[PDB]
């Protein structure tokens, strides 16, 4: 390449990272971030424990 700092934007070096995902018939181990809130008591409310 021969990257020089005085080159134009079209010739500047660009770091590219590509993420790939694969799914199979095996138990998956990668998932996405979750939520989780607070904890109230003595009230008729809906809950979701895991």
């Amino acid at each position: 390449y021969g990257f020089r700092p005085t080159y134009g934007v079209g010739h500047q070096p660009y770091r590219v990272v590509v993420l790939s995902f694969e799914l199979l018939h095996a138990p998956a181990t990668v998932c996405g971030p979750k939520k989780s809130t607070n904890l109230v008591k003595n009230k008729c409310v809906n809950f979701n424990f895991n």
């Binding site: 018939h25 095996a26 138990p27």
Partner: protein
């Protein structure tokens, strides 16, 4: 025991055995071998 792609074992030292681990490993196990 291995079933549905999970490998879990039980252990107890000095009654029922407590559970101890579990792997989500999905290999096919057919033979058994020990070493000393």
């Amino acid at each position: 025991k291995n079933i549905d792609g999970y490998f879990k074992i039980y252990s107890k030292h000095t009654s029922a055995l407590e559970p101890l681990v579990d792997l989500p490993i999905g290999i096919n196990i057919t033979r058994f071998q020990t070493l000393l």
